[PDB]
Design a protein around this ligand. Structure first.
Ligand SMILES: CS(=O)(=O)C1CCN(c2cccc3c2ccn3-c2ccnc(N[C@H]3CC[C@H](O)CC3)n2)CC1
Lengths: 322, 9
């Protein structure tokens, strides 16, 4: 009696009465998401119904993981958990999980191709980095940052949408079969910043192989040291491409593309868009760069941080919901 | 330097 049902295409959203005005804004293999209005908090929310969370151990494992990280991770620059519920009254009946988040106005896809001043550019990038740093502190490395999984509001605030693991924003480590570390996420920040400046995708590969070619065409073929780190099968392709010199960052990002500040942005870009991760800038150095550091606030940029059966996952998830 | 408080969608 505290709940009601709304049909959402072929899916039924059975939710607390506080949530009205439901409307589907997205879906994927793991869930359906509706925009809604929360009559109790008097604010807009996003409600995600998880998809087939108990179909197998793998689905259950992810559902449990997603739920635990959203609860335990807290930072203004990371999508937060407002509420979690199940419409079922018992563990025996337990089937469905709904996650409630603050409703953001947009992702970054269009915004970054509009023309932003330095202040907006750098402030958005500062917030991204603060968000990413907090993920890394919690032992979460994203590996898949892109504009579509970064959300904003009309008040110029920003949150990262998910905890990760379109190929334009993938680092070289990922493109190829390499090991990664923290600064894998810096590449994606680089691609995004560049795009804010350029007004279009930096490295728009037509396929997974072409993504590499687009990068090296602009940045240059990486040195032999790096080639040695590649697995034999991928090394055979990569090493035998024509040799590109790359263009300087002055040529890639000349003054005329921008709205000292351009010089500072270029310098930072030249340190993030580095193919060889062992030569790429880190998150901490990025936050300390004069282009980003102007917004510095320690409370934001230094914030304090197996095997089961389906029924055991059901129970672990149920406890987490209650 | 004051933080932007608006963003055009
Ligand atoms: C991998 S999965 O679970 O299948 C997949 C399902 C779909 N799923 C989502 C699809 C659509 C929106 C989604 C999600 C997950 C979170 N959101 C949110 C959260 C807060 N605000 C918005 N505001 C929006 C931002 C974008 C704008 O265009 C409209 C307002 N969208 C992402 C995860």
């Amino acid at each position: 009696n505290n709940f009601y049902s709304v049909e959402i295409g072929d899916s039924t959203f059975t939710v607390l009465k506080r949530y009205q005005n439901l409307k589907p804004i997205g879906s994927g293999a793991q869930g359906i998401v509706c925009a809604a209005y929360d009559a109790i908090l008097e604010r807009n929310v996003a409600i995600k119904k998880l998809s087939r969370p108990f179909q197998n151990q793998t689905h259950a494992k992810r559902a449990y993981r997603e739920l635990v990280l959203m609860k335990c991770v807290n930072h203004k620059n990371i999508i937060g958990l407002l509420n979690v519920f199940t419409p079922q009254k018992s563990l025996e009946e337990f089937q469905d999980v709904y996650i409630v988040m603050e409703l953001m106005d947009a992702n970054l896809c269009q915004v970054i191709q509009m023309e932003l001043d330095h202040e907006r550019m750098s402030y958005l990038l500062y917030q991204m980095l603060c968000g990413i740093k907090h993920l890394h502190s919690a032992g979460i490395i994203h590996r898949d940052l892109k504009p579509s999984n970064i959300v904003v509001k009309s008040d110029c605030t920003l949150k990262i949408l998910d905890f990760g693991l379109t190929r334009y924003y993938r680092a070289p480590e990922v493109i190829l079969g390499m090991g990664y570390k923290e600064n894998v996420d810096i590449w994606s920040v680089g691609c995004i910043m560049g795009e804010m400046i350029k007004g279009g995708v930096l490295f728009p590969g037509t396929d997974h192989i072409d993504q590499w070619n687009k990068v090296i065409e602009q940045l240059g073929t990486p040195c032999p040291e790096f080639m040695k780190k590649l697995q034999p099968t991928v090394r055979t392709y990569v090493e035998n491409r024509p040799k590109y010199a790359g263009y300087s960052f002055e040529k890639l990002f000349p003054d005329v593309l921008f709205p000292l500040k351009a010089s500072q942005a270029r310098d930072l870009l030249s340190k993030m868009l580095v193919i060889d991760a062992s030569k790429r800038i880190s998150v901490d150095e990025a936050l300390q760069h004069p282009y980003i550091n102007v917004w510095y606030d320690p409370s934001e940029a230094e914030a304090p941080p197996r095997e089961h059966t389906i029924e055991e996952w059901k129970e672990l998830i149920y406890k987490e919901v209650m | 330097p004051k933080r932007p408080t608006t963003l055009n969608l």
